[PDB]
Amino acid sequence: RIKKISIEGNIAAGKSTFVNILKQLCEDWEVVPEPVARWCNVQGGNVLQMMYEKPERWSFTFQTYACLSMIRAQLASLNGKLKDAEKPVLFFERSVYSARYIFASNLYESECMNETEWTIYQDWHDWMNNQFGQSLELDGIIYLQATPETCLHRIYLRGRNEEQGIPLEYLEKLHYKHESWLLHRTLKTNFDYLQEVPILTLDVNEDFKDKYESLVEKVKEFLSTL
Amino acid sequence: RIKKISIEGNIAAGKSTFVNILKQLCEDWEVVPEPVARWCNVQGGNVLQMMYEKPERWSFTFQTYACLSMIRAQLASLNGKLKDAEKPVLFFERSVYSARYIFASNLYESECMNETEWTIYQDWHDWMNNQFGQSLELDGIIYLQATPETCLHRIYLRGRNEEQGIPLEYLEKLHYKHESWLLHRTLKTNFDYLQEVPILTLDVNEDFKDKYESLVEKVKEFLSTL
Ligand SMILES: Nc1ncnc2c1ncn2[C@@H]1O[C@H](COP(=O)(O)OP(=O)(O)O)[C@@H](O)[C@H]1O
Ligand SMILES: Nc1ncnc2c1ncn2[C@@H]1O[C@H](COP(=O)(O)OP(=O)(O)O)[C@@H](O)[C@H]1O
Ligand SMILES: Cc1cn([C@@H]2C[C@@H](O)[C@H](CO)O2)c(=O)[nH]c1=O
Ligand SMILES: Cc1cn([C@@H]2C[C@@H](O)[C@H](CO)O2)c(=O)[nH]c1=O
């Protein structure tokens, strides 16, 4: 009965900035943030650092941990007795789909994951999916669209240590896979329904300060149709 | 309503040999073998080989894959509509407990897994446990006890390629952790109930040919008490 909407975008496109705006728009809207802070101290080791420090060594470990910690947080929001409100909406920061079809797929293609790693990752992903898939199905997607170059500047502005080494090239690859999935809708997934799911594309290259009011109307308008 | 019994022992103690004997003893007994054959070809890569080829690189990947593939096979035996028989018994080849408290714990202590790897492994283990723990709870344990030296000879007899490099030292460590857990019952787990679970210890150092008949009576006797 809970509508589930995922917020997709490249690294530093402004997802957390966008997400912090939502609860104040309506009392019925809940948000499940990406556990990024938790990833840099496990329960400790900073596995997010290890990922960027040696992707050939740590991609598989990180990517599978990232996605598991996302599943758990998302499942915990569903059980989390916030079903009782009039018309409840739950925004996911990223989803199991991008975790796999964008982030993990990209590192495999960059040879940061070998065939064995990629095969085990997928096999685990599928299994996670049929156990807790139906409950996590998306009613809609919001794509915060920004150039790789803008993202690169925003990694600098935010100043998250582990991400300061990310090159433009890495962000460019993530960009084209987002565009293939969310704009051209050309990316093949194992999930039929995703190809019909409504998608709102918002251009977030300009300052959040003077686009706020318009972005909000676009979101409110988009939700009505769902 | 299904009694669940796990068969524990060191590498090549004779678990599969013992297990092949059970279905013929009673029509109501089912067996969940360790998916070892599947581990040497993933769905492919031989991740069991990689584990022994470079334990510092592959222990975490293997150990977590080993345990997941064990959970799934075990859950599939429970759902697997073999509840309809008079007094059903399900034998597990090893369990989630040894996977963690013996095999994974040993590699962490040998520095084949770092703190981050060990922490993520445990955290995933716990989470797997509270999701599908209650359904997998053991009513009993059968410890096939053999000297590390006997096991070493049996790794040679069996001739499984990936395991041909295993040194005595590795088997000795596994032996003492089994003895600590199943004989002295001194090993601390996160699972209270395990410390009260009945355990049958069978000495399997002699030839299976002239101990068969006695082992069987011991098993039949043991099951009655449960
Ligand atoms: N539309 C925008 N205009 C100007 N600055 C932005 C905009 N969106 C995000 N920022 C800034 O960029 C940085 C990264 O944004 P953040 O929301 O943390 O990204 P994400 O959550 O997508 O990784 C932060 O410093 C934030 O203040
Ligand atoms: N009690 C026994 N006496 C003689 N040979 C045995 C005995 N148990 C096992 N074997 C032999 O030892 C090898 C390893 O046994 P297996 O059942 O495959 O071990 P596990 O399943 O514990 O890894 C096989 O060659 C098997 O024929
Ligand atoms: C969900 C996800 C995020 N990321 C990165 C990891 C962080 O740098 C950033 C968090 O916004 O996203 C991945 O590399 N893989 C992933 O699966
Ligand atoms: C269940 C399990 C088995 N093993 C090993 C892997 C195989 O060599 C052998 C199968 O009988 O047991 C592990 O190293 N870790 C494990 O968690």
> Please, what is the end-to-end C-alpha distance for chain A in angstroms?
12
Give CA angle at A165 (A164, A171), nearest 5°.
Answer: 95
Judging by beta carbons within 10 Å of its beta carbon (0-12, 13-18, 19+), is residue A54 exposed, middle or buried? Answer: exposed
Alpha-carbon span B197 to B187, nearest angstrom: 13
Length of chain A: 226
Angle between helices B55-79 and A55-79 (to 10 degrees): 30
Spatial contact of A120 and B61, defined as CB atoms under 8 Å apart: yes
Resolution in A for the shown PDB structure? 2.3
C-alpha dist (Å) from residue B35 to A24, A182, B39, B42, B48: 51, 39, 7, 11, 11
Is the CA virtual torsion B4, B8, B11, B17 positive or negative?
negative
Distance between start and end Cα atoms, chain B: 12
What are the DSSP E strand ranges found in chain A?
3-8, 29-32, 89-93, 140-145, 199-203
Q: Do B120 and A57 touch (CB under 8 A)?
A: no
Residue A4: beta bridge partners? A90
Phi, psi values for residue A197, rounded to 5°: -60, 130
**Alpha-carbon span A56 to A72, nearest angstrom:** 26
- Distance between CA A149 and CA A154 in Å, rounded? 9
Experiment type = X-ray
Q: How far is CA B49 from CA A7, A63, B54, B59, B114, in A?
A: 40, 23, 8, 11, 20
**Contact call for B61 and A115, based on CB within 8 A:** no
Range of the domain at B155: 1-226
Q: Is B131 helix (H, G, I), strand (E, B) or coil?
A: helix
**In chain A, what residues touch B117 (CB-CB under 8 Å)?**
61
What kind and span of H or E run contains B60?
Answer: helix B55-79
**Nearest CA among B63, B140, B56 for reference residue B96:** B63
- Please state the φ and ψ torsions of residue A3, each to the nearest 5 degrees: -70, 135
Q: Closest ligand to A157 CA?
A: 1
Q: Which 8-state DSSP code applies to residue A23?
A: T
Q: How many domains does chain B contain in total?
A: 1
Q: Which residues of B touch A (CB under 8 A)?
A: 42-47, 50, 57, 60-61, 65, 68, 72, 114-117, 119-120, 123-124, 127, 131
Q: Which residue has the tokens 């098993």?
A: B219
Q: In angstroms, rounded to a whole number, what is the distance separating the alpha carbons of residues A5 and A177?
A: 20
Q: In what order do the strands lie in the sheet with B3-8?
A: B29-32, B89-93, B3-8, B140-145, B199-203
Burial of residue A211 (CB within 10 Å: 0-12, 13-18, 19+) is middle
Q: Is A152 in the pocket of ligand 3 (CB under 6 A)?
A: no
Write out chain B residues lying below 8 Å of A65, CB-based: 120, 124
Q: Cβ(A13)–Cβ(A148) under 8 Å?
A: no
CA angle A207, A210, A213 (to 5 degrees): 125
Determine the Cα–Cα distance for residues A185 and A203; give it in Å rounded to an integer. 17
* B158 CA to centre of own chain: 18
Q: What DSSP state is assigned to residue A100? A: I
**Region for residue B40 given its phi and psi (left: phi exceeds 0; alpha: psi -120 to 50; beta: otherwise):** alpha
CB A222 within 8 A of CB A142: yes
A20, A34, A154: which to mutate for ligand 1, most atoms within 8 A of CB?
A: A154
Burial of residue A81 (CB within 10 Å: 0-12, 13-18, 19+) is: exposed
From residue A92, give the alpha-carbon distance in Å to each of A22, A31, A34: 12, 6, 8
Residue spans of beta strands (DSSP E) within chain B: 3-8, 29-32, 89-93, 140-145, 199-203
Q: Around Cβ B160, how many Cβ atoms within 10 Å?
A: 15
Residue corresponding to tokens 């007994």: B29
CA dihedral over B47, B160, B41, B102, signed as positive or negative: negative
With contact defined as beta carbons under 8 Å apart, do B56 and B45 qualify?
no
Q: What is the CATH number of the domain that holds A113?
A: 3.40.50.300
Tokens of B113: 């897994």
Residue keyed to tokens 């299976």:
B208
Tell if the CB–CB gap between B116 and A44 is shorter than 8 Å. Answer: yes
Return the sign of the alpha-carbon dihedral for residues A158, A164, A166, A168: positive
Q: Which of A61, A114, A127 sits opposite B117 (nearest CB)?
A: A61
